[PDB]
Design a protein around this ligand. Sequence first.
Ligand code: FAD
Ligand code: LGC
Ligand code: LGC
Length: 569
Amino acid sequence: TTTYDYIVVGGGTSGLVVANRLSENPDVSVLLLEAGASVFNNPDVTNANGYGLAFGSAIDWQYQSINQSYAGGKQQVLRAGKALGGTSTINGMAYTRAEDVQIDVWQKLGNEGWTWKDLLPYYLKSENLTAPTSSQVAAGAAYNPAVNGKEGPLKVGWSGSLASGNLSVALNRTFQAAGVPWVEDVNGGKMRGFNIYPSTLDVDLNVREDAARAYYFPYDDRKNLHLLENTTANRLFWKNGSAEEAIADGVEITSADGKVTRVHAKKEVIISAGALRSPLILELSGVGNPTILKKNNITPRVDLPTVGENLQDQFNNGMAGEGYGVLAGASTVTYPSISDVFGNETDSIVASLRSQLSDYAAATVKVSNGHMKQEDLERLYQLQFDLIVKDKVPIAEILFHPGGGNAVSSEFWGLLPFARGNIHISSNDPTAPAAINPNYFMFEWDGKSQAGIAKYIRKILRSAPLNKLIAKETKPGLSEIPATAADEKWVEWLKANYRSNFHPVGTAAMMPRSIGGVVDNRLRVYGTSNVRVVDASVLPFQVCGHLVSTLYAVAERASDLIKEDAKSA
Ligand SMILES: Cc1cc2nc3c(=O)[nH]c(=O)nc-3n(C[C@H](O)[C@H](O)[C@H](O)COP(=O)(O)OP(=O)(O)OC[C@H]3O[C@@H](n4cnc5c(N)ncnc54)[C@H](O)[C@@H]3O)c2cc1C
Ligand SMILES: O=C1O[C@H](CO)[C@@H](O)[C@H](O)[C@H]1O
Ligand SMILES: O=C1O[C@H](CO)[C@@H](O)[C@H](O)[C@H]1O
């Protein structure tokens, strides 16, 4: 009565895709476990313009970092969705993907089958894009039909409120004058440019298109698909027998009524609890660094000491200006390259970074207490360097939107910092807060690039034709950071005012085991027969764009791999 073919732990962005796809086989039973509950009628969620409203609420996990020792010692809140739909219920709504070559790097790493060419069909499979209205088109909204799906569960489209306005027209021209092309679609593998981005929006209903509205609710009539909400997965438990290779028997759970029980999986357990939880579940299950497991009175079952290591996140800053009059128009995204941002200074910046890569790798070794090797980190960082410098992938995202009245707001983040951190359990109590350490600002590039982006935005606000609309910069403003200001004043300000960008990846990274990978190219946890991780944990490097599009695609592909593996096994 407690047995299912598959258990999916976490009914979030990724997990709901897997549960959907596996349950396409009517003879396969799937159990979803989700710690939160439906947010179908939570207005903080449904509101197409409600991003931010849910922060601090019962549907925000509000995870907490440790003191960030490279950024002045301040701890950072790391937000995440506690809801059916996971973090797709509380996030921003921009639908953007990744650079083609940066997905190709996954296969170069040694992960067979993971290239842009191989992933593109799964982006398409996930997506149902609604074409823009005539008025949205006049404002700049466009897409390439060849790279957008029309049949998938995730509705994508442009806001009902999208209109031409002085701001969006001026930003297009001003970015073009800075040498950044207007591009019609950032989602065909080439992201560099200025774009009127689409969103995860159901335009028929004008509501947020979260992962549950996409992949769960229209399918919840399936009798082979089962959901336990308000149910916390504590750890996996294992079949007992001298298979040295570990076989999961099921998942231990705590219900809302406080009952603590087991559910069993006949085939596989799929862990989709997010990059800040999936590794904890592995550790609590005895899969991880034996030093940490033993310290916390957990019997080691698989010696896999990079569980929770290789955490990579971005950090987010904001600037603002004031118009002479009211500012209006479509929200915009710009993805500039290193040379777009740095102009005549690019060669200097590249030379400096080049000269630092080995030092960054050496410095990263201690983060994992020696469980990644310098030589291997150096090769990883060389891949990332080549993406930035040789392929000229975007190094920044810059968002602009009207800020109400005469205000214009920009938020921005460096896309590819080199800092790595980690996350680990603090006890064997599943409710105890983890030790989460992204190491924001660890390396010079990370802060120098952020500063370069900020200076670039300062310049944009003062450039034509935008400067005809914008009276002045209000944040930071010239009093706080004078026009004559050096790189370092900007870095200090950015450190004082940043937040997490809430894009953590890599804590159960898909890489060869021999360079510290946690899952193989089919997302199977090393040393296990039948456990996978399918969520942001597995991304081995950061990507340029907004994570959900890529996680949907990765989970779509994973689902096919799981089905293939069942047929022979
Ligand atoms: C505020 C914010 C804004 C963002 N902005 C954007 C954006 O505009 N666009 C974009 O694409 N991305 C954005 N991101 C990132 C993106 O939303 C996430 O990377 C993505 O949703 C993560 O998906 P996931 O499947 O890894 O995990 P999640 O969606 O977080 O799913 C994990 C699920 O597991 C559940 N869970 C966790 N622990 C347990 C347990 N022990 N037992 C049972 N269930 C459990 C959770 O409650 C959750 O439902 C944003 C993130 C945040 C926090
Ligand atoms: O993807 C994102 O877009 C958001 C803007 O839409 C930003 O605020 C979040 O920090 C970021 O995670
Ligand atoms: O997290 C934050 O703290 C910053 C100050 O510490 C603030 O300026 C930003 O607006 C905010 O995102």
